[PDB]
Amino acid sequence: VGADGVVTHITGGNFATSSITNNGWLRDFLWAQSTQVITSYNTSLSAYGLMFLGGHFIFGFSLMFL
Amino acid sequence: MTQLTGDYAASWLPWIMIPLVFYILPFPVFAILFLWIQKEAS
Amino acid sequence: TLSGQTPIFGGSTGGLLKKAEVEEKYAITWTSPKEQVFEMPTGGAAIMRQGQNLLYLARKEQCIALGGQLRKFKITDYKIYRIYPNGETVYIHPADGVFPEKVNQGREKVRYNDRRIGQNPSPSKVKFSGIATYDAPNS
Amino acid sequence: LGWVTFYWHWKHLSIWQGNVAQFNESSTYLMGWFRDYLWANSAQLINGYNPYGTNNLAVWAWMFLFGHLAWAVS
Amino acid sequence: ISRKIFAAHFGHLAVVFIWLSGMYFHGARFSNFEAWMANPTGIKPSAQVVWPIFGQEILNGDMGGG
Amino acid sequence: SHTVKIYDTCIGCTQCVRACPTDVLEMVPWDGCRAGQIASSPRTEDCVGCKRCETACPTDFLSIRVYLGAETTRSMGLAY
Amino acid sequence: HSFAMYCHNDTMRAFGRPQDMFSDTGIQLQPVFAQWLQHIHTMTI
Amino acid sequence: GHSIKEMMDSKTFFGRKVEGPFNLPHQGLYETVNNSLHFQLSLALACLGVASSLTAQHMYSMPPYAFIAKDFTT
Amino acid sequence: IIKPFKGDPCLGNLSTPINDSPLAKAFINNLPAYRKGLTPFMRGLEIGMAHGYFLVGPEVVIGPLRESAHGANLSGLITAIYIAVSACLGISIFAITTFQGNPKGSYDSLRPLRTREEWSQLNGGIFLGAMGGAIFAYLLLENFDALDAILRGAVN
Amino acid sequence: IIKPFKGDPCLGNLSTPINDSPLAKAFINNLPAYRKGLTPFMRGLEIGMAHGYFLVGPEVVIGPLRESAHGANLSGLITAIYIAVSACLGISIFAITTFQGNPKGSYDSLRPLRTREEWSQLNGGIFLGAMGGAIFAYLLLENFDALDAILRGAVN
Amino acid sequence: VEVAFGAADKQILIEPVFAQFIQSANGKILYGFHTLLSNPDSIAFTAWPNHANVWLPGWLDAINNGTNSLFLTI
Amino acid sequence: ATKFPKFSQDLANDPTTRRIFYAIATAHDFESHDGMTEENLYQRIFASHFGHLAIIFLWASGILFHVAWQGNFEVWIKDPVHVRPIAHAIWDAQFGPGAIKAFTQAGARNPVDICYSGVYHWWYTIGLRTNTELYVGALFLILLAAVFLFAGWLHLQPRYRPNLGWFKNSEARLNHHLAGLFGVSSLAWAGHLVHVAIPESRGQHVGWDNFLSTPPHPAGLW
Amino acid sequence: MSISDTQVYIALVVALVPGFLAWRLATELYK
């Protein structure tokens, strides 16, 4: 909140218009909000970028047994 | 534009061939293709 | 034929369907010296009577899953029939009166191969022939 | 062939865009395969139809999502 | 059976208390609970510092207040 | 309508007959065992195909097979 | 009626028909019984 | 000409007594390939999935068609 | 109380307040699919007319033509023509293919149409039923501005 | 090859590739005049609808009213009413007058409608058939400017 | 983990020096193995008894131009 | 006890819905069909290769017909780098106005598809320059697909079915597939390149009424 | 210069020749 009273949200009213198509969940939620875990190398969020990619391993690894 | 036109020759021909082979003819075709699948032998 | 009183069962949903009226239907028949309660193969629980019992089942695996239950109630006298819709009651279990676990005489070696299992012929021996490789009249 | 044609595409998408030093420095670890190839190049694809419009990739943005449905239903 | 159930709950409750004494000990010795209680807006909540080996001290990001 | 063949490696332990849920197998007399028995399958039209007789055979590379063939209404277990 | 209405909206948005899909601007599906409980729990203070 | 049935069973190499082609027993392989329609089909798909990789590995490096190098998507 | 289905505890149904009520038994057995003493054409003519009448509904107000008025009622009628041609296609296809030696079992209720002359007569009913109803609800929708007036006294 | 008609060399026909093919026998014996297992109403309802649909054709584009648009489709419908009233008049007149002791011969194929209750049911089919088809092709022709738009995406 | 933990210089980078030798044995003069069609004083470049490599000066203009996909930089 | 599938009688008496699906994925396995010998085996392999070659020649005649009719091969051939090819046209009657406009690309007056197959670059190289040589090549492949549907019908007639000794003639098939199928038809393609594709890449137009007079070389035929 | 209006109709009747001959083959292979 600023010094007038209006609120600028984190994604900005994005759920009302774009969460009704599941291309909007792909583009506006999974692609657009993972710019903090993709570009999290060389920084202090570096372990979250490794657990993100170590997570995708164990899912695809699960499909050997399933 | 706001309409499906055709600059090519015989542009009336997709106007009838696209409803024909996709939603007018297949339910006849799926009827004929069902009458020999479930046809009895004697 | 068949006769007996049905057990006290309050109706179910896993019972007979339109197959039992049109194709075939099975009937197990036992007698009980007690008013005991057993588990139905069609889901639930029923109280068998003290006389001749009679229960209509839909397929033969339901009768012998029930027949394997009565043998734990020390009831080993059950007869399983198979009722075609024209009324023809054949009698199928136990066929000779004796249970198929213990041996009786006069019974035949039916579907028996006189070889080891590992010396069945190759499927290229029986190519473009009517027989399969496990029929194989040589040995 | 999702490793052959992922490497044909990214080696050539770095030559055609001139950025040959993008593949040559970030294909040696699996984050750059995920950040610079999959996440980066799907920007112009999933925007085949935004809430504000629709371009000529609106059928490739739909087939891309028809193919996630056919994969998941498998 | 029920004596095995009752005695295994006690060994489970003695496992929660190990973990609950690890959350209060990490807030005691390895945290900025002093700096966070003074300013709960600018200082970020942090426990669980990381050892200086294998170059993983890049995960020790700045939490406000040194 | 499956095909339950029985080979001469049998030992007459009657374990396949007790494991059959549909009474396909039965014990007939024989000469090549100490029990003097061998299994036979006269009610192979009642073969439900479930291969539970095959898990009970203790002879190595078992003496009974179920060859899953042309399945019918009583060889598929349909109560409807 | 929950997922294939996300595939109806996904096809109308790609077709360039944003007035035909289940939006707040197109075919509105309002939570009538859940917008009413938000009205009750602020009129009972 | 050559008889393929003779090339399988030939056990004489200028007076020597080799077991066949490359001193390896290839006898009975003529009537194994010729009667099997799956031996002939597997050899024809292995030799067509090499010519289909070789199509792909060569047509991007040595393009045979006019201005197909400057059409990046085809 | 819930007793077994018509006194048979071995049958796979229950004699429940929904299927064996006095009310819901006298409502289901008086619907035209089950009403006693009807020719199969009059069964299908009443089943069809109740279906052509409502099936033009969901396309003239939320269809692709809802923004106009004269073209909205065409796209709702054209829908119910195609729903009821392809459904009355599927029951001529049903009776050709299920009556070949197994007339729904020669050996029974909830399906009292077991003859193939009782089904070819039914298919003629549902066709002329579901397109009299599709036109009656089309003539009551393209003439809605003239029917709002006679149901409000605006025609004096 | 052309063999005699069903093995009889004395009968006056030939078993020719046109009448005794596999294809043209399975097309003619599946037309609604010859399809097996149809009530005579459903024979006539399908025969009629295929005829009311095209008979409005040759009068709305080369008739006397072709210069207009709304009056063209009336003169094409009015034609197919009069063609199909006077044809379904002529087959009630046919069955009254040929079923009096000679039911197309009591003693046979290509004419399987030999009963006079199988012909009075047929006449009810061709009437309601050839005027459902005459209206469906009338409602698809007076609404042609609204159907050119929905088959070209002009309605968004 | 090395790029994630800051030290991108601690990556194990094996230079593929056996397939960089193939390009340098066909005409790619970028690496500098300087052998066998990268060395113009060789037996394979000149073909000393006949000198009939009429294909060769046109080929080396293709492999050493950096605008085609013929033997890309490895 | 149904008629379908007619090739296996152990599946026609299936009482379940397994009969439909297992008759799809067994219909081409001719070696397991009921009542088949080895001579009748090969004569249905042989006559279904004919019905498969006709699918290839009708598919290649749908590439040519749809860029002669709906493509821009006359427009693309004048600036083949700065214009996109056209595969065919769009007739999806449920487009909105935002998808008619978005798909009206590459200088078309209708919605179209940009061809990513590369057949425009193939026909520019081998010497096709107009939309009529594409059309009469599409009408020829229709008729070429008709002589392969007719040949497949021919070799099931009992006077024309080959015997098992002809199918197992492995040395005579290798002679004609190397010399005739791979040798002559690669000799013939060097005939097209020398006569048509090389002179049409140099400006002069060589067609069917032109190739018998103008030789492809000034030192020609000698 | 695209093809004429008649050349489309010429192609539709030429392709009835492999449309009918595809039916002669599909039934001689005995579906």
Ligand code: CLA
């Ligand atoms: C010269 C005579 C001749 C010719 C032209 C053919 C032609 C053909 N035959 Mg036949 N055949 C012949 C004689 C001939 N045959 C004889 C005498 C016999 C008696 C034994 C047979 C027995 C026979 C049978 C049983 C069958 C055929 C079949 C075929 C067809 C193959 C299908 C196809 O698309 O091929 C391929 C088409 C190409 C254009 C080849 C290009 C693709 C290849 C894979 C790449 C070539 C590149 C090369 C190999 C690369 C390496 C070169 C090397 C120097 C490095 C084809 C049209 C099949 C058929 O009926 O189809 C209808 C089949 O079932 N033939």
Ligand code: CLA
């Ligand atoms: C097999 C190649 C092939 C393919 C993939 C297509 C594909 C297409 N055509 Mg077609 N067409 C073809 C050959 C082909 N064509 C030939 C040779 C002709 C000349 C007669 C035509 C004449 C034609 C016209 C007039 C039109 C199309 C149109 C179309 C489009 C929609 C389909 C449709 O409604 O029309 C129906 C298709 C036909 C009337 C003829 C197709 C039948 C061909 C001859 C053979 C295909 C059968 C195939 C071999 C079956 C095997 C596959 C099976 C085993 C699964 C579609 C992209 C429409 C369009 O332009 O869209 C905008 C359009 O109206 N085509």
Ligand SMILES: CC1=C(/C=C/C(C)=C/C=C/C(C)=C/C=C/C=C(C)/C=C/C=C(C)/C=C/C2=C(C)CCCC2(C)C)C(C)(C)CCC1
């Ligand atoms: C369950 C129930 C319910 C419901 C019901 C419903 C669901 C409804 C409905 C309804 C409906 C849905 C109705 C309808 C109808 C109809 C009609 C009334 C019709 C008609 C018609 C006509 C009259 C036609 C005519 C014609 C012809 C014949 C042809 C020519 C043309 C014309 C058009 C003239 C309730 C809860 C309420 C209660 C009770 C029970």
Ligand SMILES: CC1=C(/C=C/C(C)=C/C=C/C(C)=C/C=C/C=C(C)/C=C/C=C(C)/C=C/C2=C(C)CCCC2(C)C)C(C)(C)CCC1
């Ligand atoms: C020989 C042949 C041929 C031909 C065919 C033809 C001749 C055609 C046609 C056609 C036609 C000619 C068709 C038709 C149709 C129709 C329809 C589709 C109908 C309808 C209808 C309806 C739906 C109606 C309705 C209604 C009613 C009932 C009443 C009320 C009103 C209304 C209107 C609603 C060819 C060569 C091609 C091929 C094959 C063989």
Ligand code: SF4
């Ligand atoms: S099959 Fe098993 S149970 Fe039967 S005789 Fe052999 S070993 Fe005994």
Ligand code: SF4
């Ligand atoms: S398949 Fe089942 S029913 Fe048949 S013999 Fe084996 S265990 Fe018994």
Ligand SMILES: [Ca+2]
């Ligand atoms: Ca709309």
Ligand SMILES: [Ca+2]
């Ligand atoms: Ca006039």
